[PDB]
Write a protein that binds this ligand. Structure first.
Ligand SMILES: Cc1cc2nc3c(=O)[nH]c(=O)nc-3n(C[C@H](O)[C@H](O)[C@H](O)COP(=O)(O)OP(=O)(O)OC[C@H]3O[C@@H](n4cnc5c(N)ncnc54)[C@H](O)[C@@H]3O)c2cc1C
Length: 445
């Protein structure tokens, strides 16, 4: 017959934009829907590791990577300090940053990806909340709701559910929700106002060397782990502070936290004032206190008829750390688009199920390693013990993660995964260490 493949994408965060670009560059017709005004600045910085940048580098013949070049990480080490600000450990980043990594405001990453998606012909509809997905053996559909209450049925060959950690699409796949477990920790975090930071002489130290090497400082205080970073030659500074918090906080990016809670936490220790000299230039409405919740892996990501798939934080939400949360979502988009092109238009359900088998254990392993990091904090004493790079929130920094080429793996393994899906056998993926799958309690889909 020959009609274009019709892809529906629900949610244009990082992962939905990546999926839109990957699918459109395979020639599909892509209609993406997003309920919020995503061009408005919100949040702070996102990191992307080499497993994500090697995917991004292929897009638009390298054009997106060229746009992101100012944001390539130039830190060569993490400088880890105690509560007096004395340097204890320099953790070398030369292998992690052998290939490009990015650090940049999330809103700027969104803007660059959005502009590329428009340029290549992704159809985008903002101010639309998608609900009520359905599917049968031949296609899928959703209801698109504008804010003024107009309803429209939208039909497609399959739905990519990239609607984030609070995904309402997720109830179409998993009938019952599993509530995440609070880690007992939260992260104060924000961007600093660079203009007021400049011209505060008591904060001038933070600019030292940032035009040659991005700042990447960590400080361990009793009950407080503070990271301070710069990017794009000192144009942007960001920070976070991991701390105990048992309040019933919502995991959203929209509510202003009390800056004095952060000040009280750090000002009683020797380095606190020096840290505050920079962090006090955070705009008073931009202080975020984000709870770190641990989500268990889902039983599966693909719907009964194989025409809806959860990817990104809808499927495997992690704490904002490493860059690996976002980076795993970008691998979702790449593997899914590659699977769709190897399977062909007549085998959509196969393509989605193959993508799931390739992604599931690897994504779940990154998720469970993330849990181990914040579960370790309850047994630690950051005042009594010397600072330990093993305790930093930026972990894991593992070659089997950031060195991986998800597209090449998918090409090589596609026919083997097809046989597993069609025969109903387990697929033992080798895109994570052999013993890691069994070691973490991971149950194959
Ligand atoms: C406003 C915001 C700010 C963030 N800031 C940071 C930050 O500074 N640092 C960081 O590390 N991570 C941040 N994150 C999280 C980060 O984007 C994710 O953890 C991950 O990197 C990518 O997840 P995602 O693309 O799957 O989902 P998300 O980034 O959460 O995107 C989901 C998108 O789907 C949209 N959506 C949800 N439901 C519907 C629906 N029914 N119909 C239509 N659209 C829908 C949402 O409006 C949102 O744009 C932020 C997320 C948000 C939403």
């Amino acid at each position: 017959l020959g009609e274009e493949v019709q892809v529906i994408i629900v949610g244009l965060g990082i992962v939905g934009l990546a999926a839109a670009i990957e699918c459109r560059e395979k020639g599909h017709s892509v209609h993406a829907f997003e309920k919020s005004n995503i061009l408005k600045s919100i949040g702070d910085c996102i990191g992307l590791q080499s497993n994500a940048t090697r995917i991004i580098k292929r897009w638009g013949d390298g054009a997106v990577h060229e746009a992101l070049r100012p944001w390539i990480v130039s830190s060569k080490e993490i400088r880890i300090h105690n509560s007096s600000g004395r340097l204890i450990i320099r953790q070398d980043l030369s292998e992690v940053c052998e290939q490009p990594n990015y650090l940049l405001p999330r809103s700027e990453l969104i803007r660059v990806m959005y502009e590329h998606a428009l340029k290549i012909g992704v159809e985008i509809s903002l101010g639309v909340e998608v609900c009520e997905p359905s599917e049968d053996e031949e296609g899928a559909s959703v209801v698109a709701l504008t804010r003024d209450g107009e309803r429209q049925i939208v039909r497609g060959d399959f739905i990519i559910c990239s609607d984030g950690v609070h995904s309402k699409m997720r109830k179409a796949i998993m009938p019952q929700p599993v509530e995440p477990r609070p880690s007992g920790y939260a992260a104060f975090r924000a961007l600093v106002d660079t203009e007021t930071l400049k011209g505060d002489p008591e904060a001038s130290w933070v600019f030292e060397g940032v035009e040659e090497n991005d700042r990447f400082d960590v400080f361990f205080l009793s009950g407080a782990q503070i990271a301070l970073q710069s990017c794009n030659k000192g144009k942007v500074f960001s920070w976070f502070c991991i701390h105990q918090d048992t309040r019933n906080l919502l995991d959203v990016w929209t509510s202003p936290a009390d800056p004095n809670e952060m000040l009280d936490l750090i000002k009683v220790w020797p380095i606190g004032q020096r840290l505050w000299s920079v962090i006090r230039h955070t705009q008073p409405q931009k202080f975020i206190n984000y709870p770190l919740l641990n989500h268990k892996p889902l039983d599966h990501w693909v719907s009964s008829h194989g025409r809806l798939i959860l990817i990104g934080d809808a499927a495997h939400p992690l704490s904002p750390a490493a860059g690996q949360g976002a980076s795993q979502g970008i691998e979702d988009a790449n593997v899914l688009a590659t699977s769709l092109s190897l399977a062909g238009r007549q085998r959509v359900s196969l393509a989605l199920h193959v993508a799931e088998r390739i992604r599931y254990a690897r994504a779940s392993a990154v998720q469970l390693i993330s849990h181990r990091v914040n579960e370790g904090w309850r047994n630690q004493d950051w005042d009594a013990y010397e600072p330990n790079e093993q305790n930093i929130a930026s972990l894991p920094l593992e070659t089997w993660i950031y060195g991986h080429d998800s597209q090449a793996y998918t090409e090589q393994e596609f026919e083997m995964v097809v046989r597993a899906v069609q025969e109903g056998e387990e697929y033992h993926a080798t895109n994570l260490p052999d013993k890691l799958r069994v070691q973490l309690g991971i149950r194959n889909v």
